Amino acid sequence: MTQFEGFTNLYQVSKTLRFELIPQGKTLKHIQEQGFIEEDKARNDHYKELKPIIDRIYKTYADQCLQLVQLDWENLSAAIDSYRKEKTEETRNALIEEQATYRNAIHDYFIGRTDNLTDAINKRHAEIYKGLFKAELFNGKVLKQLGTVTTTEHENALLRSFDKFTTYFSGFYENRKNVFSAEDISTAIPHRIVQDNFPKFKENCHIFTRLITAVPSLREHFENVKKAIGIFVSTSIEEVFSFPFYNQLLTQTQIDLYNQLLGGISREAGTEKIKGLNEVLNLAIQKNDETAHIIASLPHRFIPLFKQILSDRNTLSFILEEFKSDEEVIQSFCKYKTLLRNENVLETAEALFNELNSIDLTHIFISHKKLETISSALCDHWDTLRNALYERRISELKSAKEKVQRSLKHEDINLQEIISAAGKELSEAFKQKTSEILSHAHAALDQPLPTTLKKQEEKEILKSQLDSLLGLYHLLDWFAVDESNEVDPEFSARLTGIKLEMEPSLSFYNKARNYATKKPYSVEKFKLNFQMPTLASGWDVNKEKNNGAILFVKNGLYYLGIMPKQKGRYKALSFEPTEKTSEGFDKMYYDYFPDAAKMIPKCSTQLKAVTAHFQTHTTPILLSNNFIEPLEITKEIYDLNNPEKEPKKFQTAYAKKTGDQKGYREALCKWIDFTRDFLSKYTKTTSIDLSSLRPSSQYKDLGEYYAELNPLLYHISFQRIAEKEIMDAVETGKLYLFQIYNKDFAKGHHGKPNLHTLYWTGLFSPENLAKTSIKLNGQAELFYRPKSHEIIKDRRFTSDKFFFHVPITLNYQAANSPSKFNQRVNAYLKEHPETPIIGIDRGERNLIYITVIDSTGKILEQRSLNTIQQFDYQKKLDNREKERVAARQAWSVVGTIKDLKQGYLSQVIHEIVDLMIHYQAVVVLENLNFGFKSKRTGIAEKAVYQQFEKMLIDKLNCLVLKDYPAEKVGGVLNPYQLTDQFTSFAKMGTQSGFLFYVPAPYTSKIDPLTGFVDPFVWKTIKNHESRKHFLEGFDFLHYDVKTGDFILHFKMNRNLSFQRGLPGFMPAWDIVFEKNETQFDAKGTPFIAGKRIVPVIENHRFTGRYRDLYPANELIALLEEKGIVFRDGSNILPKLLENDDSHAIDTMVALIRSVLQMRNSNAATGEDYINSPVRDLNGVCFDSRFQNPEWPMDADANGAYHIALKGQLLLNHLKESKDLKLQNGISNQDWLAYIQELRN
RNA sequence: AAUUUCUACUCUUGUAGAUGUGAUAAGUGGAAUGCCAUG
DNA sequence: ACTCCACATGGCATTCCACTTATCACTAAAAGATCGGAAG
DNA sequence: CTTCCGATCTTTTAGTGATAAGTGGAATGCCATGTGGAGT
Ligand SMILES: [Mg+2]
Ligand SMILES: [Mg+2]
């Protein structure tokens, strides 16, 4: 009988606690006068300068390695094709093996162990790779093998400024070893080549060959654009899109050339662009030819490749010049404005714009491409000018319409024909517009310039002037000056003169926009090192004089002590432990042996002495260094750890590959005995009570043995020190004493502590000291942030503050990773039938909506989480989102919205977790594609689709409730672990512990009472005869004489060509045009039943705004206008389709589409209800405006309710699942059939 | 209207909830401006 | 107190911003470089 | 006047089994369409 309290101590999690350090006593004088802060600031600055200098070596080596790659890519393409054909486990394993094989084949060039290279080149690559992650980068032991980097004297000084400090780059070495490795890291060069870029290139090749097979002219078009751009002159376009061409496109230059082939080289702005592959395909589609209809079915976009991991991008496009400071942009703009003033732009522009009143307008022309701008700016709509032109061309006349459209689409038009088509109103609006634009330009030129671009007003005035100048340039670009059509000579010459004068303003606008929108400078913290190469990397007492980090405890206040280097040497400061009743500090005594898996072979088998001993003779060697008794290394022990092959004989890989269970068991037992002897004999571990360990032959696998052994090697004890010694040490300057501090260590605190304060207090509590459940970690780091009753706004930023980031580890007694975590949760849900569901719907109108259901589908609690603790967070997020949108267009400080969303979700996660604990339920979420949620966050960044799964999963991974006692599960020492260990979103399955993912579709627009959905898809009824065929497919519809509602019948075996392909459980439906009378809810508000909300499509091409519709009222109005009698209750459908008028059939289809729309939304009045087009067997049509608590209230509440029921389906199928596994997704047919069978 | 830091506050020199840091790399999405086209 | 109206989209290019996603470390001790004093 | 070497400070190192990712596509929906401005 498993229990809900059993979900604890399953896996380790690592957390970082952050505290402010208060300098205690005279330590601030000693840390300031020795210049540690300034030296560490200079060290950080030199590191930031030196990082790209070092990166040049890695980029050069990666280039020189990747130009030598010569592989055959047919096997990987075949593997991907076979995986895409059928998604099964065996083909997935084959694809994983092939990807690993190619990732190793790429990695062999970096190592220098490939057959297809010479021995000298391989030796050079091996000797380059050997010193690539060491101090050989600094002292030139590997730089002279390359030579191409060509470091100058300042770069050499920067490189040698880190003398005896190379281990500062240790984390950089770990970061850069991920790149040159083939261990399936996403941030690796071979993984990027094999798994990221190659599927994109294969899809591009398949797209190209399909496109060429469909139409032959696109081959000539692609050859012409490839010749015109100027890339790959030796390879044809049939050879570029081929598998052997992927031996290139590995270095960044070839990738950028391929991307410029796809996208197109761009010249300077104001000059015609050379099109790309995607651009010319979009141009061919937009022509609306028959070939466009051919292409539209095909997938018509080539996918560009990704950047290489280190090499920077370069392009053939016009990289436009940038300014460097506010002084330069103001001085350059003042010079440009002065130049425009003495050249006298404005009087000759006004002469041009008043010359139209006394000139023959037949010798002037308007550019064809910009007539839409004039139409939008001058008249009520963009279509008015071209509609007038079309009517005028008709008035002076099948094929003639095409001739008129072809004349209007590409040939310039004179202004006299414009003035004949439109009349006096366009003339007066035109001169008014030029007068307004010239007035704006004159006002901009007379207005002085601000000095600096610091505050918003000084940037807004600059934008106001420069946009007016751009508007005058746009107005001046209206006229056509080219010789292809007739034009007055002197006017054209002077017009191109003033346009040539005005040309650089458009580039000036872009330069000022690129400068003015930069992020403002803000002071940031930097890592302190106290002139120590390895400061605070470990708390151990053996390393306490080299690391310097020692913790203390003083009557509940926690202190940190740093002993600096004295005259450049490590003075081993020692403390004498005294009697416990003496007043003073309690020193923390750390005892650790970091990991048995890495430290048993290092201190036993991988010594230089042992390896040198075993390459001449097989006699066992006795080791005496750091051993109380001489330990013996035998021959078979050394060959167990060095088997001259990748799998070792005592590990699970050998047993899986070979199957020799007996040999694996013998090797494992020998290794356990050897580790026991080693831990018995080593001085560091000779006092460890190893009697609690199991015998050697009982362990199933070595990882279990290490997971059991590791908690025994960690220990903390506290020793008393006299206060006089510590005070003398901190006064003399031999010790820097800081107090670990936050809000909860203040004088007057009353309430419950912070969660991290609970972690810190529970780490050093006596019960955790007796048995370690929370582990204090190394690699602590110190940061210094400078300067950026008496209650003061932003008091914390008024002075410099020392920070202290310290990692901790929770659930230390557990394993590193859980052992089949989902099996335990599935077993617990299998043995517990009555388990609720806390299903969640995410959106933007309602940010989070939840519904809690029981096992029988009833509603326990439904509630919108737009407001928590009397704060409507959705309105605040909407205001912030609108402020950011309006601020990024006025060149303001955009700011951050992540903080407010995190604040809102901190409340939401607490409410959801509180319901989880109080109901002992599961949480079902909707499985949304990353593209969809990124698109919806792009449209409105108020939304919380992302940043909600991550916080919920990370909270449930280590859930500590503040109220609960520490010894009880759920306390600070026994956290709840209700989710699987979070590694990455890609590797997450459909179930993560108690959190469930169900498919998204058919959860909102579904009737909760009977499970009806709209069966049609409205894209297939675009034409009138299809509307006739859709109309004759229905059985009947007639007016009920006693209830006043039209009852339309449906049989599901009809209109299969218009259905979306989901036959429901029911064979028939009763679609009802309900009587539009007044109904009252529980609160007494009136509403009209059957009301629908539909956007207006009166223009037949655009989506207008919403309007209220009444299907019964408009239906009876249509039928009374037609005069068709219906009071006898007879079927009207054959009486209706007997006429050939398109208006009646069109409004019939419109009414049917409107009545079948379940979701009715109107953001202006705040209405999100659902009305049901069909009738329940109880004789009540559903309407959520009744607001009965047994049924959902809004549409998002309905969405949450059907997320809950979709997870109810999974839990219902779990009870009959003998394999303790869930379904492999839920098909929409299965879900609809299940819900419609449950309702009926 | 105080906070390691974020969010909502002020019976309380503080309250309630949350908070994995550092480093590196990549991608996505907005906005402005150009070019070719579409309604 | 009513009613009309606000140009929109597709493919690329440049710059700027914000935000997300995916790896590594959470480390004592063995090995190697350096140096001040002893010995020749 | 020159050479060695034991102390001491940086620097590099050692490396387990999680076994996962369970598939089901063939297309849908998953959510919403600027909401706010003006004259008369
Ligand atoms: Mg939903
Ligand atoms: Mg929803």
Amino acid at site A577: P
Residues 541-560 of A with CB under 7 A from strand C: 542-543, 547
Token match 């018995």: residue?
A680
Token match 């261990």: residue?
A183
- With the CA atoms of A308, A312, A318 and A320 taken in that order, what torsion angle do they form, in degrees rounded to the nearest 10? 140
Strands A848-853 and A736-741 come out as: unpaired
Q: In what helix (H) or strand (E) does residue A657 lie, and over which residues does it extend?
A: helix A652-658
- List CB contacts of A381: < 8 A, sequence separation 6 or more: A375
Residues 1138-1177 of A with CB under 7 A from strand D: 1161, 1163-1164
Strands A848-853 and A840-842 come out as: antiparallel
Amino acid at site A300: H
Ligand nearest to the CA of A1159: 2
Asked if A44 and A526 count as a contact pair (C-beta separation under 8 A), the reply is yes
Measured on CA atoms in the order A470, A476, A479, A480, is the torsion positive or negative? negative
3-state secondary structure A197-208: HHHHHHHHHHHH
State the nucleotide closest to A11 in CA–C1' terms.
D18
Strands A1078-1080 and A1068-1073 come out as: unpaired
Q: How far apart are the two ends of chain A, measured CA to CA in Å?
A: 36
CA distances (Å), A1014 to each of A1017, A1151, A1152, in order?
8, 14, 11
CA distance A1020 to A1116: 27
- List CB contacts of A212: < 8 A, sequence separation 6 or more: A218, A219, A238
Span CA (A786) to C1' (B15), Å:
29
- Resolution to 1 decimal place, in Å: 3.3
Label residue A48 exposed, middle or buried (CB < 10 Å: 0-12, 13-18, 19+).
Answer: exposed
In degrees and rounded to multiples of 5, residue A962 shows phi and psi of -70, -30
Number of C-beta neighbours around residue A1010 at 10 A:
23
- The length of chain A, given as a count of residues: 1240
Could you tell me the two tokens for A188?
């690796």
Report how far Cα A309 is from the mean position of its chain's Cα atoms. 19
CA distance A820 to A708: 18
Helix %, strand %, coil % for chain A, to 5?
A: 45, 10, 40
Residues 911-930 of A with CB under 7 A from strand C: 930
Measured on CA atoms in the order A1099, A1105, A1108, A1111, is the torsion positive or negative? positive
State the nucleotide closest to A1159 in CA–C1' terms.
D31
CA distance A550 to A846: 51
Q: In what helix (H) or strand (E) does residue A721 lie, and over which residues does it extend?
A: strand A715-722
CA distance A775 to A715: 9
Residue A117 zone, left/alpha/beta (φ > 0; ψ -120 to 50; rest): beta
Chain C bases having any atom below 7 Å from a protein CB: 5-8, 10-32
Chain B bases having any atom below 7 Å from a protein CB: 1-9, 12-39
Span CA (A314) to C1' (D12), Å:
37
Span CA (A939) to C1' (B29), Å:
9
DSSP state of A246: G
Annotated binding-site residue numbers of A: 47-51, 175-176, 307-310, 747-756
State the nucleotide closest to A187 in CA–C1' terms.
B25
State the nucleotide closest to A1222 in CA–C1' terms.
D22
* A926 catalytic residue (yes or no): yes
Amino acid at site A501: E
DSSP assignment of A939-982: H-TT--STTTHHHHHHHHHSB--SSS-SSSTTSSSS-B--SPPP
A271 CB less than 7 Å from any atom of strand C: no
Token match 């696109």: residue?
A218
Query: Could you give the angle at the alpha carbon of A96 between the alpha carbons of A92 and A98, nearest 5°?
Result: 115
Instruction: Give me ligand 1 centre to Cα A1159, in Å.
Output: 13
CA distance A352 to A435: 12
Query: Could you give the angle at the alpha carbon of A529 between the alpha carbons of A523 and A533, nearest 5°?
Result: 140
Residues 791-810 of A with CB under 7 A from strand C: 807
Asked if A968 and A953 count as a contact pair (C-beta separation under 8 A), the reply is no
Asked if A1002 and A1231 count as a contact pair (C-beta separation under 8 A), the reply is yes
Asked if A269 and A510 count as a contact pair (C-beta separation under 8 A), the reply is yes
Query: Could you give the angle at the alpha carbon of A965 between the alpha carbons of A962 and A967, nearest 5°?
Result: 130
Ligand nearest to the CA of A839: 1
CA distance A534 to A1233: 65
In degrees and rounded to multiples of 5, residue A738 shows phi and psi of -115, 150
CA distance A296 to A282: 10
- List CB contacts of A591: < 8 A, sequence separation 6 or more: A540, A541, A714, A715, A716, A717
Q: Closest by alpha carbon to A541, among A577, A500, A501, A495?
A: A577
CA distance A772 to A761: 13
Token match 């080791």: residue?
A623
Query: Which protein residue lies nearest to nucleotide D15, measured between its Cα and the C1' atom?
Result: A598
* A134 catalytic residue (yes or no): no
Delimit the domains of chain A by residue range. 192-297, 326-516, 526-592+715-810, 598-712, 821-1003+1218-1239, 1018-1191
Instruction: Give me ligand 2 centre to Cα A1163, in Å.
Output: 15
Rg (CA), chain A: 38
- With the CA atoms of A377, A382, A387 and A392 taken in that order, what torsion angle do they form, in degrees rounded to the nearest 10? 20
DSSP assignment of A357-392: GGS-GGG-EE-STTHHHHHHHHSSSTHHHHHHHHHH
CA distance A309 to A312: 9
Token match 């260990």: residue?
A981
Instruction: Give me ligand 1 centre to Cα A1202, in Å.
Output: 8
DSSP assignment of A538-578: --BSTTHHHH-EEEEEETTEEEEEE-PPBTTB---------
CA distance A258 to A899: 40
Instruction: Give me ligand 1 centre to Cα A1170, in Å.
Output: 14
CA distance A1179 to A1192: 19
Exactly one of A219, A1028, A1159, A1239 is catalytic; which is it? A1159
Exactly one of A40, A108, A326, A926 is catalytic; which is it? A926
DSSP state of A869: S
A651 CB less than 7 Å from any atom of strand D: yes
Label residue A293 exposed, middle or buried (CB < 10 Å: 0-12, 13-18, 19+).
Answer: exposed
In degrees and rounded to multiples of 5, residue A526 shows phi and psi of -135, 155
* A800 catalytic residue (yes or no): no
Strands A736-741 and A557-562 come out as: antiparallel
Span CA (A569) to C1' (D8), Å:
9
CA distance A670 to A674: 6
* A1114 catalytic residue (yes or no): no
Span CA (A138) to C1' (D27), Å:
58
List b or e across A326-364, with b for residues whose CB sees 16 or more CB atoms inside 10 angstroms. beebbeebeeebeebeeeebbeebeebbeeeeeeebeeb
Token match 């104001």: residue?
A270
Q: Name the H helices within A396-423.
A: 399-410, 415-422
CA distance A991 to A116: 46
Label residue A485 exposed, middle or buried (CB < 10 Å: 0-12, 13-18, 19+).
Answer: middle
Query: Which protein residue lies nearest to nucleotide B18, measured between its Cα and the C1' atom?
Result: A906
- The strand pairing partners of A1090, in sequence order, are none
3-state secondary structure A797-846: HHCCEEEEEEEEEECCCCECCCCCHHHHHHHHHHHCCCCCECCEEECCCC
CA distance A385 to A374: 8
A602 CB less than 7 Å from any atom of strand C: yes
Asked if A953 and A13 count as a contact pair (C-beta separation under 8 A), the reply is no
- With breaks defined as C to next N over 2.5 Å, after which residues does chain A break? 397, 788
Amino acid at site A834: E
DSSP, collapsed to helix, strand or coil, labels residue A1076 as coil
Q: Closest by alpha carbon to A1006, among A834, A1213, A1211, A1238?
A: A1238
Residue A1100 zone, left/alpha/beta (φ > 0; ψ -120 to 50; rest): left
Asked if A138 and A160 count as a contact pair (C-beta separation under 8 A), the reply is yes
Instruction: Give me ligand 2 centre to Cα A920, in Å.
Output: 25
Exactly one of A424, A608, A787, A793 is catalytic; which is it? A793
Strands A923-927 and A995-999 come out as: parallel
Amino acid at site A469: L
Token match 């930023």: residue?
A797
Experimental determination approach used:
cryo-EM
Chain D bases having any atom below 7 Å from a protein CB: 8-36
Asked if A827 and A839 count as a contact pair (C-beta separation under 8 A), the reply is no
Instruction: Give me ligand 2 centre to Cα A914, in Å.
Output: 23
CA distance A753 to A760: 11
Query: Which protein residue lies nearest to nucleotide D23, measured between its Cα and the C1' atom?
Result: A1224
- The strand pairing partners of A549, in sequence order, are A562
Within A643-714, strands assigned E span none
DSSP state of A249: S
Q: In what helix (H) or strand (E) does residue A905 lie, and over which residues does it extend?
A: helix A898-919
Residues 266-295 of A with CB under 7 A from strand D: none
CA distance A950 to A842: 14
Q: How many CA atoms lie within 13 A of A452 on its CB side?
A: 2
* A644 catalytic residue (yes or no): no
Span CA (A760) to C1' (B16), Å:
20
Span CA (A1071) to C1' (B19), Å:
52
Asked if A959 and A976 count as a contact pair (C-beta separation under 8 A), the reply is yes
Asked if A672 and A706 count as a contact pair (C-beta separation under 8 A), the reply is no
Instruction: Give me ligand 2 centre to Cα A1004, in Å.
Output: 6
Annotated binding-site residue numbers of A for crRNA: 47-51, 175-176, 307-310, 747-756
CA distances (Å), A947 to each of A74, A869, A951, A985, A1122, in order?
40, 21, 6, 12, 57
Q: Closest by alpha carbon to A253, among A344, A316, A190, A174?
A: A316
CA distance A68 to A124: 13
Report how far Cα A649 is from the mean position of its chain's Cα atoms. 42
Exactly one of A192, A1005, A1196, A1206 is catalytic; which is it? A1196
A279 CB less than 7 Å from any atom of strand C: yes
Query: Which protein residue lies nearest to nucleotide B38, measured between its Cα and the C1' atom?
Result: A286
State the nucleotide closest to A14 in CA–C1' terms.
B20
Q: How many CA atoms lie within 13 A of A1142 on its CB side?
A: 5
- The strand pairing partners of A1093, in sequence order, are A1108
State the nucleotide closest to A682 in CA–C1' terms.
C29
Amino acid at site A29: K
Number of C-beta neighbours around residue A653 at 10 A:
12
Residues 673-712 of A with CB under 7 A from strand C: 684
CA distance A4 to A194: 44
Query: Could you give the angle at the alpha carbon of A1100 between the alpha carbons of A1097 and A1103, nearest 5°?
Result: 45
